[PDB]
Ligand binder design. Structure first.
Ligand SMILES: O=c1cc(-c2ccc([N+](=O)[O-])cc2)oc2ccccc12
Ligand SMILES: [Zn+2]
Lengths: 161, 47
């Protein structure tokens, strides 16, 4: 039930997603090891993901959280990078997209920094880099990230290195 | 998949050393996210 609609680079919606992508790049403490060495991206395509069933699943749960948190879903737009992006867009997030060894337990992780999610595109720690060249810092191969609508509700605050 | 801490719907990882890092978040139910945009890109070699 998923269809992908291409956005024109002229569309203000394309532009505001691109801007969030570019403006949230930072330097990482691994010096580029996991995600590569870069200060910005070349954006090749942005597509809107439409799946009625997955959308209503999302909104049904959003309402539940909202009613548990003084009518405040605490919804954000956040980045997610994963080897499983194609399963995610067709079947939704589930158990199988969790980070079992993440510092905040086994759950599904999202970032405000696009460059942080970029570190997971080829796997945890960048895996072995791109399929074609085995290069975590590959400048040739096409990468994909998700920009996602996320319900946080009442969020537990963990201070941390 | 683990559970949220009792009485919470998610975890926020707040950076407490790297002054430039933004926050990271964790949810424990798939239904709390919708994958709205697919962005295809390349990283660019600095000059
Ligand atoms: O975008 C993210 C994807 C992932 C991630 C982690 C593990 C898997 N996995 O188990 O294959 C997938 C994506 O982890 C993050 C951690 C911190 C911030 C953002 C992310
Ligand atoms: Zn490559």
């Amino acid at each position: 039930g998923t269809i992908l609609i291409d956005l024109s680079p002229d569309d203000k919606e394309f532009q505001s997603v691109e801007e969030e992508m570019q403006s949230t790049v930072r330097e990482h403490r691994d010096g580029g090891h996991a995600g590569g060495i870069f200060n910005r991206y070349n954006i090749l395509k942005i597509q809107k993901v439409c799946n009625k069933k997955l959308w209503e699943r999302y909104t049904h749960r959003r309402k539940e959280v909202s009613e548990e948190n003084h009518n405040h879903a605490n919804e954000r737009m956040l980045f997610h990078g994963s080897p499983f992006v194609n399963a995610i867009i067709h079947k939704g997030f589930d158990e199988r997209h969790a980070y079992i060894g993440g510092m905040f337990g086994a759950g599904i992780y999202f970032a405000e920094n696009s460059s942080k999610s970029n570190q997971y595109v080829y796997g945890i720690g960048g895996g072995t880099g791109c399929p074609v060249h085995k290069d975590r810092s590959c400048y040739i191969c096409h990468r994909q990230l998700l920009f996602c609508r996320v319900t946080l509700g009442k969020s537990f605050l963990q201070f941390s290195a | 998949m683990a559970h949220s801490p009792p009485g919470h719907h998610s975890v926020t990882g707040r950076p407490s050393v790297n002054g430039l890092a933004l926050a990271e978040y964790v949810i424990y139910r798939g239904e709390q996210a919708y994958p709205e945009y697919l962005i295809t890109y390349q990283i660019m070699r600095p000059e």
